[PDB]
Symmetry: C2
């Protein structure tokens, strides 16, 4: 009846409940990079619990640090005071992140880390003495507007040409309006929910140049892409960018608990530092900010990154997956395949010559994902882009098994 009960009471995030009612799924537990439902059936975790599960479920040394931190204290506040593991994690996060990012402002979630970034950005200009700086630049498809080098559906198909066109179009937009912009928000290297659109080489760097040149702050959303995943600690390493502000989460705790961070340059911190009377204080916060348990599990997740060398591991297991996922090209209705590190997606198309998309009512992304659930694998389709973002743990043979279960399930339905 737990199934029956999940229909009566819940209301699930980013899902249409009529499709859940027709196909229920309730997990009980999980081990390694797998999970088990309540009428015991086991799956892979192809979407690593939506882009946050680093070393699998039941990982020993994370289960360890939570238990330990229950030994001391589970939650005390960061409002006006602080606590030990937040204080320690902060130090670790300053060292493992771009050098210009000196500060750290915690919150419960990715979206909260970005809203926080926007609010610092807006409030920084207001503090220093340039209130004109209000407007923002969203990057088209960004989960004013500026376009992102989406080269597969471009005019020339050429990365460098698409890139430089997107840079130029941004540059024109900055040329004309910069003296009223405050900040620019961009996902670090890969637009996630937009279909896993990898940015071509030199894009991010161009944005950084143009932001510096034009006195707009660069905000870099590293929530999906951070903590391994891209085959670096943070995806903005791939071009040596220092964001002015950067939002992080998901894989900060190993997958276990909800913590997020907003990193901030010291120049930015300084703008909010002054006597209380002036109302310069950044007035933002949440009540479970600096959770001891979250900070403790994240500290040991951050230790594992350094000891078990999980980042460098990922960069070698990717190469394997470069060719092993180029094997998807063989299938007829799989018009493009993208990756950066473990961050992977296969865009489905009706015609390879025309790259024509399927209709969205033909439901092909979702219909595929149900057939993986048939064959013991879990993912989420972004439209008709099937996502493949598996645990960083996941060994090169599982990396290989999933990709076939994926490929098998695509072909089974994409023939229809």
């Amino acid at each position: 009846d737990l199934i029956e009960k999940s229909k009566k009471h819940l209301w699930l995030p980013f899902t249409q409940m009529k499709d859940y009612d027709e196909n229920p799924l309730i997990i009980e537990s999980g081990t390694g990079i797998k999970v088990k439902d309540i009428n015991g059936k086991e799956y892979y975790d192809g979407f690593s619990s939506v882009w946050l599960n680093v070393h699998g479920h039941r990982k020993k040394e994370l289960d360890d640090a939570i238990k330990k931190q229950l030994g001391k204290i589970a939650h005390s506040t960061l409002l006006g005071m602080t606590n030990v593991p937040a204080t320690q994690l902060a130090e670790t996060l300053i060292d493992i992140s771009p050098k210009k990012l000196t500060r750290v402002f915690y919150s419960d979630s990715g979206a909260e880390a970005m809203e926080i970034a926007l609010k610092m950005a807006f409030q920084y200009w207001k503090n220093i003495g340039k209130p004109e700086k209000q407007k923002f630049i969203a990057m088209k498809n960004g989960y004013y507007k500026a376009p992102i080098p989406y080269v597969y559906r471009s005019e020339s198909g050429d990365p460098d040409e698409c890139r430089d066109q997107c840079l130029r179009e941004l540059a024109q937009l900055l040329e004309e309006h910069h003296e009223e912009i405050a900040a620019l928000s961009i996902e670090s290297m890969v637009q996630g929910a937009s279909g896993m659109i990898v940015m071509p080489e030199g894009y991010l760097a161009g944005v950084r140049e143009l932001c510096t040149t034009y006195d707009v702050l660069m905000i870099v959303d590293e929530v999906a892409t951070g903590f391994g995943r891209t085959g670096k600690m943070f995806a903005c390493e791939h071009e040596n960018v220092q964001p002015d502000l950067m939002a992080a989460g998901k894989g900060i705790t190993g997958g276990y608990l909800p913590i997020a961070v907003t990193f901030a340059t010291e120049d930015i911190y300084k703008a909010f530092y002054d006597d209380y009377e002036n109302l310069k204080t950044f007035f933002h916060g949440h009540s479970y900010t600096g959770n001891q348990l979250g900070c403790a599990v994240a500290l040991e997740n951050l230790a594992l990154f350094e000891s078990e060398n999980i980042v460098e591991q990922v960069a070698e297991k990717s190469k394997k997956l470069h060719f092993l996922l180029q094997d998807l090209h063989a299938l007829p209705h799989v018009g493009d395949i993208r990756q950066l590190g473990f961050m992977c997606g296969a865009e489905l198309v009706r015609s390879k010559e025309t790259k024509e998309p399927y209709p969205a009512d033909r439901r092909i992304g979702y219909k595929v994902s149900l057939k993986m659930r048939e064959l013991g694998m879990l993912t989420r389709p972004l439209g008709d882009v099937i996502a493949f973002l598996p645990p960083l743990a996941s060994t090169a043979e599982e990396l290989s098994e999933m990709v076939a279960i994926m490929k098998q399930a695509i072909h089974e339905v994409t023939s229809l």
Copy 2:
């Protein structure tokens, strides 16, 4: 070392770090209703860690459930599927919630639980045919748009509650008469304005807000984040007027204070409007990644199981009788303007003179200077400007309360007296 560290790397919420640098503080541990800083010192947690903590620090039962749960699975997603604790907790949450509220949408914070409610309420009307329904009504100074007045008795002409009560209810009617077809929802704290300064509403203010909201087809958003799960003397504060909100937000107390879990509650009417085939674009495109954490739901399950066992709710009701008398002492101080309380939510409002009702000026920092004095005396609290906010754990005993209130009297006395 940690002190020097905290000062060089952290950016803390709702705090001038310049202040944190004259007066830093780093908790290491806690035991029942006490916390222990790094230099050994002990404090009463007289703000329940900002209105979260219910049973005490290091409570075995809650300690146990997280370990229990840990050896199943720490986190599996609610995007498109579910998990066992969330599905159980929800059943539970439905029984203790009001009747009309039969869905549970989950999230990581109170702020988020409100944010979801606004989007649900906003989008609700789009999905049914009335998209012109789109503006909200915010109750003035409402920490969670036409602003609508809310009865603050102490500084109200009347001095009489019901006159301040009914006067505000009408002003909301004059708003609702001439603007209701544009209005999606109304947003209101359940029984007490927290951040505003622990301002308690007259009985049947919230009743009257709810009967008007029905008469004009506006949705009633009830924020129970600060006032939920015991704090007022009921499991939910709106029970003080039997009230049936269309959307209710919760967080905080829900996990006894251990983890972050928060919930938006919805009526089955609302939920209905998002039920369809995907084609129709009826869906609610929202919901964070750590939605339905096993560890937070597990800790919450147990927290509520304790609520059920010990009878924490009637216990607070019991102990609040004591608390009111215990707070009577505070009114004997020259500068304590006024003492507001419902359940464990109390506020002593400070003033230059308790005859003019004239507050102190903002730069003199009378709330902050007292909060520090309390720290010095071994108590943690956070002011709401010159409103000083006592909110002790719901496990707090009769004598702990007397000691916390004593420290508070000592503190307010010593700082107000000195400003002369």
